[PDB]
Automatic annotation (TrEMBL), chain A:
Compartment(s) of residence: Virion membrane; Host endoplasmic reticulum-Golgi intermediate compartment membrane; Host cell membrane
Name of the protein this chain belongs to: Spike glycoprotein
Residues included from the entire protein: 494 to 591 of 1353
Protein purpose: Spike protein S2: mediates fusion of the virion and cellular membranes by acting as a class I viral fusion protein. Under the current model, the protein has at least three conformational states: pre-fusion native state, pre-hairpin intermediate state, and post-fusion hairpin state. During viral and target cell membrane fusion, the coiled coil regions (heptad repeats) assume a trimer-of-hairpins structure, positioning the fusion peptide in close proximity to the C-terminal region of the ectodomain. Spike protein S2': Acts as a viral fusion peptide which is unmasked following S2 cleavage occurring upon virus endocytosis.
Domains (record comment): Fusion peptide 1 (FP1) and fusion peptide 2 (FP2) function cooperatively and have a membrane-ordering effect on lipid headgroups and shallow hydrophobic regions of target bilayers. They are considered as two domains of an extended, bipartite FP. The membrane-ordering activity is calcium-dependent and also dependent on correct folding, which is maintained by an internal disulfide bond in FP2.
PTM annotation, UniProt: The cytoplasmic Cys-rich domain is palmitoylated. Spike glycoprotein is digested within host endosomes.
Organism name: Middle East respiratory syndrome-related coronavirus
Description of how the protein assembles with itself and partners: Homotrimer; each monomer consists of a S1 and a S2 subunit. The resulting peplomers protrude from the virus surface as spikes.
Entry similarity comment: Belongs to the betacoronaviruses spike protein family.
Amino acid sequence: PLKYSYINKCSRFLSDDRTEVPQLVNANQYSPCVSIVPSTVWEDGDYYRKQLSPLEGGGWLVASGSTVAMTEQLQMGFGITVQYGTDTNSVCPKLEFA
Amino acid sequence: QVYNFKRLVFTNCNYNLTKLLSLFSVNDFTCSQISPAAIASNCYSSLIL
Amino acid sequence: YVDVGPDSVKSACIEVDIQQTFFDKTWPRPIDVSKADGIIYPQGRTYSNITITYQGLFPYQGDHGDMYVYSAGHATGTTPQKLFVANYSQDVKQFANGFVVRIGAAANSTGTVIISPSTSATIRKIYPAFMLGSSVGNFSDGKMGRFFNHTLVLLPDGCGTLLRAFYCILEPRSGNHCPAGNSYTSFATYHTPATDCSDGNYNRNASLNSFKEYFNLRNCTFMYTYNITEDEILEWFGITQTAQGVHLFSSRYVDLYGGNMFQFATLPVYDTIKYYSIIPHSIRSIQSDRKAWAAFYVYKLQPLTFLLDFSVDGYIRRAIDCGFNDLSQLHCSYESFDVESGVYSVSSFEAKPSGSVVEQAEGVECDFSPLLSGTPPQVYNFKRLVFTNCNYNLTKLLSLFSVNDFTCSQISPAAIASNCYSSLILDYFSYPLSMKSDLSVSSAGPISQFNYKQSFSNPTCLILATVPHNLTTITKPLKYSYINKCSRFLSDDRTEVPQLVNANQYSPCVSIVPSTVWEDGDYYRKQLSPLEGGGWLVASGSTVAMTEQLQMGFGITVQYGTDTNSVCPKLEFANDTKIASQLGNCVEYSLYGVSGRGVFQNCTAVGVRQQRFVYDAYQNLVGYYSDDGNYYCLRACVSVPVSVIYDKETKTHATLFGSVACEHISSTMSQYSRSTRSMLKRRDSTYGPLQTPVGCVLGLVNSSLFVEDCKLPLGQSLCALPDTPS
């Protein structure tokens, strides 16, 4: 990546300009704020906004982010989850039945 | 980026995760609610990465 | 990306006319839960003929569904004509944990054409088309239902034997009657039987190509297809979504006759669906060859639990929605479809909510009265009032002057009045309207240069206004004045350094200039001490003639607390219903942070007075002294216990509301204890409440007979009787 980046804020402003609604990410779901945030954060502490649709009652989407310097070797992470079942268990370790 | 995740759903297929382990140096391995050996040996309705 | 094939070459489309008044029909189809209608089979397991409880997503038993009817388009003579369709493209719904549908329920029967219904054509099964996605919005002509980024498309192609699924980005077309064009009305799709579906060559791409005529495919990431065969029998289909992706269900592959749904397929897309719509479609057949189409239904899934009557072949043949009525609740408590006769308790009515009652300290106000008397200061001499922790109404404050300039920076002028802040600060001074061109934080004028400035670190405002003839305590300066120079001569008596006024601060030159400037162009000088580095303070000023009514200017700044915003525009029920007290039913409340739901009443007073909250040994709020000096008592809110009478021989029932008495009992309740009260209306639609010594009942009848043992005795001498033998 040109820089490693992350969103360090995700909330929506209330339409009355006095309060704000936080938006923590839901498990196994993209944060709603991704719709406004750029594929990378151009500068540390950048923030973005989008007006909410009238179907949402108005107010503004808000998000902000931060970056980390690129490194000699790429660094990455993984998340693993599994799902239990009975006759749906077709994912398996390679097997030998000899 | 941390808000852009790629996902792979795995069904109907066979695996050997140690082949994947050879491809990277692991600097952090932690599994919740399951031993790491077991998750490698367990068979599942799905595997998600 | 996926090889969907080429874009149709023409940008042109067939015009879509909305004919929606033709499609109003009343043909409801409530779920027959005892036939297992709409039941999705459990995942991955099967069972014996033993009845078991189960939890999963299912439709409510009482839902009649949403109905949609597909129809032929306009045609005349021997040829096609511009389309006549329903307004279904605008029906966006929020997604709500999936849905199920009925297809072919009206097969092997007759109806009408709908769009030209006088022909009375027979009706046949048709497969539905749908669009799903994470966002919706306006089309460029303001039309409803445009979707964004990638969406699901569920489209049958040609005859009902071919089905396709897509995940792609739609692109609008600029052609006549198409989505980027300004001749667009609404999106629709079509099929043409004249060349489509030949018996030696079914047209596999037919409906997709008519879809392509309104939207270009771009960036497509999935396509799938399925094989179906024709069958006039009714089918069930549906959708769910999980973190493993979207799943598809049908009764067709496994249970053609019983109708139980099974998970036919799954999809790789796990992107959240927030919205749902149905795509309108039409037949392009010749006017005398048109055929009417069968009714189609939609029901939404819910997190319910059910009894399921498995067959020895594992099909669910019967089911009980536990929450649909209290008889169904009784069945779920015994896990069976045949509960023994008896009198049984059922859950109580919750009573009902009522609007809130709140009491808190009032009269905050904000010291703003100094502005109404004496002579206001010259603009360089402006006076400031700081306000924290207090209540205000600036729009009331500003009705004391006619405002000839209401502007602000980094806040709208309306918003600063309604916004709460950690502090509110007001500056005021006399100011002629003739100088108004020079009053801005950005102004080039001498007022911004030397007299008054506001920081750009806080929202600020500037107000010009004049005094009403009824503010006689306000008085005016002999002339309006301002400083038009402020600099210090450098100690070498040739170099000079200007002193522009500091934000939110008096100019240094105010120390030499008189409280008013006696004449235009007056100037003053002050020698400076060696501690100052020497030099001379120098300043000058200018004036404007006094006027019939005083003219004034104001400055406002605010600080928003991160969590310290104690200054707010609180009003004492201005423009409000006045919920200081209600007397009243079960109104929810907040008394200085004490809260709950309950009823207050005007009763005697017990001590100790001024403790406000009266409690019992269990710390229950017994009652309350209000700020009106009256003691009210709090009784919370009574609920209504209910029990039912179940006669297993006749398979009928009746209900006892007991102690509630028939004075609160009515044909319908606004309480409530269960999903429906229609279980009693089965007979109660023709009867009123019956008050008894034990308590009000429904469906009981006054027979005044004498019976030794009715088995279903209600206690006392008030036993009810079952009907006679068949």
